[PDB]
Write a protein that binds this ligand. Structure first.
Ligand SMILES: NC(=O)[C@@H]1CCCN1
Lengths: 214, 218
């Protein structure tokens, strides 16, 4: 069961640094390479660098000179990348990937979101979206004015999922807004409670909004 | 650096149909050791990339046989046989031969399905939000295809062009549709000075805009 488990989302400051972690399990860490790959919002993939934890060899990308240093702790089977001299356009999802000569990037971590910004962390407001006069009924939640990404949004603690649309966050000034809709049989609601559950890890915020009819 | 250019940029293809993706390199990508480290990766919406093919045409274990590769020199091709909804996402080629290793710019695979009109729903501001001095009206335009759609807001019949914030989903493999959220925000003060709030969706599936509205006195 090969697994690459990466650290959680980050908020980094312009000019500063951030260290990312990638803990390997299910295979022999020192028998494979380990690459970092970056991906900007609505952009493609970019290879940052690779280190071989067994031998300590590092393959470099001159484009990241002074911006990335790769290390590894053989003891804990964990790989690190230190991203430095950060600027706003270094905001991206950063993946680690097991890198083999036989197959390539066969296994990937889940990715670590890194936001580079001087803006302050802001907890979201969560507002219920109760339908108006108008066979199925659609309800929603509006998650407004938070920073940084990400938030998690679920409906009835995950029980409802098949009728759910959660929309990508849009950034306005230094605050994100997100929304989510859930469509259910007109027989279900309101004679059955529907609640959206929002978590914002950056502010340790959790908020529930039970959708009640107008 | 080796430039990797993919064509097409966007690939709409019907379920069950074949698709082909071209990846051109600015130069040869044969490594000194004789190997051509040309790989293909798929990134589904909101997921980590998946290895599909390595060394030009070797399929990675667990990948369906519907994916196959070919090519030589400076042009490589990924083929997808019998496209399935789960295949939608972005396909990247990659060379691991010359430093620095480089990816292609990516090809957006879209499932081409039958046209679907949007299901439009409108929602007034909550009392809780009004307390903070702002008022957001929300419109959902859900499960439509193709992605091309326009939303317009009207207050007491007149078009409102400021205060609007729009978000678009990627295609949902569940039914190969898109969805879109539009939020109109104004001050609580202005919100209370009007009666009628309307969002209108214009889509190829209807000669007339799809209209959803409420009146604060209804
Ligand atoms: N020198 C090279 O072409 C590759 C690139 C990184 C390590 N080997």
């Amino acid at each position: 069961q090969v697994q690459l488990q990466q650290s959680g989302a980050e908020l980094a400051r312009p000019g500063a640094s951030v260290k990312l972690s990638c803990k390997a399990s299910g295979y022999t860490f020192t028998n494979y390479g380990l690459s970092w790959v970056k991906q900007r919002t609505g952009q493609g993939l970019e290879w940052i660098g690779e280190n071989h934890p067994g031998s300590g060899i590092i393959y470099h990308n001159e484009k990241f000179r002074g911006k990335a240093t790769l290390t590894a702790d053989k003891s804990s089977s964990t790989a690190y990348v230190q991203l430095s001299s950060l600027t706003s356009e270094d905001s991206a999802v950063y993946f680690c990937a097991r890198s083999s000569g036989t197959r390539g990037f066969a296994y990937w971590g889940q990715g670590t979101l890194v936001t580079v910004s001087a803006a302050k962390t802001t907890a979201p407001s969560v507002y219920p979206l109760a339908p108006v006069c108008g066979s199925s009924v659609t309800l929603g939640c509006l998650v407004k004015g938070y920073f940084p990404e990400p938030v998690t949004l679920t409906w009835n603690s995950g029980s409802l999922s098949s009728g759910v649309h959660t929309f990508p966050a849009v950034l306005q000034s230094d605050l994100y807004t997100l929304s989510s809709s859930v469509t259910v049989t007109s027989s279900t609601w309101p004679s059955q409670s529907i609640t959206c559950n929002v978590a914002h890890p950056a502010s340790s915020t959790k908020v529930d909004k039970k959708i009640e009819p107008r | 650096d080796v430039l990797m250019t993919q064509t097409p940029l966007s690939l709409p293809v019907s379920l069950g149909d074949q698709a082909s993706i071209s990846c051109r390199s600015s130069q040869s990508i044969v490594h000194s050791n004789g190997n051509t480290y040309l790989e293909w990766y798929l990134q589904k919406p909101g997921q980590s990339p998946k290895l599909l093919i390595y060394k030009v045409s070797n399929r990675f274990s667990g990948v369906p046989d519907r994916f196959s590769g070919s090519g030589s020199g400076t042009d490589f091709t990924l083929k997808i046989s019998r496209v399935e909804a789960e295949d939608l996402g972005v396909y990247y080629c990659f060379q691991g031969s010359h430093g620095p290793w480089t990816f292609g710019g990516g090809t957006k695979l879209e499932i081409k399905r039958a046209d679907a009109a949007p299901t439009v729903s409108i929602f007034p501001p909550s009392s809780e939000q009004l307390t903070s001095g702002g008022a957001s009206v929300v419109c959902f335009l859900n499960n439509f295809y193709p992605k091309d759609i326009n939303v317009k807001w009207k207050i007491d019949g007149s078009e409102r062009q400021n205060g609007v914030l729009n978000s678009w989903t990627d295609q949902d493999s569940k039914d190969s549709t898109y969805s879109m959220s539009s939020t109109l925000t104004l001050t609580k003060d202005e919100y209370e000075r009007h009666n009628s709030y309307t969002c209108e969706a214009t889509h190829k599936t209807s000669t007339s805009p799809i209209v959803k509205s409420f009146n604060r006195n209804e």
